[PDB]
């Protein structure tokens, strides 16, 4: 009776958000709506966890925001990976790919 | 490329290894080095750190192993509640994979 850790739930939310960011520019609710629809029945999205990660990536210069137009009031905030954020994200998926391969190799060693 | 793997990556690998049975820190490092063709050397201090955190909540226990070549290693094992935790850990990550498939398919 030891619950799975908060750090893991954050890591999984991080993975999903980064995967969505990898697909291209988007508005925040656009991301959220896509994740909720895909998550329904699989995982309860913690909106606060998602928000926290979003804000951290922005503060860290991995994503930057812009407006879809220049008329104040009622706009959707869009976000894109920056120069360094693209690099960070590519490293993130590459490093997880290396893990995936190690697990496959461990599985194959175990079965030998 | 950063000096260390992400904690979540080290945890994933450690939990996969321990799912297979009891092990000691050098042994886990050696098996993961082998499985990576020498390319991934997990951080021994990180492993000890993770084990201390898991032992705190009863997920892992430890003991001094059978003597080999003049001494004993400190083995770690998942307990019964630890295998439960581990199953829920891997299940949650399986759900991530399903979510990604749903995003890919737009369904």
Residue numbers in the entry:
A (entry chain A): 1 to 112
B (entry chain B): 4 to 110
Show passages lifted from the paper.
In previous work, we have introduced pAF into lactococcal multidrug resistance regulator (LmrR), a small homodimeric protein harbouring a pore that exhibits promiscuous substrate binding capabilities, either by direct incorporation using the dedicated orthogonal translation system (OTS),19 or, preferably, by introduction of p-azidophenylalanine (pAzF), followed by a post-translational Staudinger reduction. Incorporation of aY into protein scaffold LmrR gave rise to an artificial Friedel–Crafts (FC) alkylase exhibiting complementary enantioselectivity to a previous FC-alkylase design using p-aminophenylalanine as catalytic residue in the same protein. X-ray crystal structures of the parent and evolved designer enzymes suggest that the introduced mutations cause a narrowing of the active site and a reorientation of the catalytic –NH2 group. Position V15 resides inside the pore of LmrR, and is the same position of ncAA incorporation as used in earlier works featuring pAF as catalytic residue.
Several variants from both SSM libraries performed better than the parent, of which mutant V15aY_RNY_N19W (RNYW) showed the largest improvements, giving 98% yield and 93% ee when used as purified protein. Remarkably, while V15aY exhibits the characteristic LmrR structure, forming an open pore at its dimeric interface of similar shape and dimensions as observed in other LmrR structures, the V15aY_RNYW_KK structure appears to be more closed and exhibits a narrowed cavity. Furthermore, a significant difference in the rotameric state of the aY side chain is observed (S11†). In contrast, in the evolved variant it is placed closer to the pore centre, directed more towards the central tryptophans. The narrowing of the dimeric interface in the evolved variant can be directly linked to the RNYW mutations, which enhance side chain packing between the α1 and α4 helices. Moreover, the close proximity of D100 to the aY residue suggests a potential interaction between the carboxylic residue and the substrates, similar to what has been proposed for V15pAF_RGN.
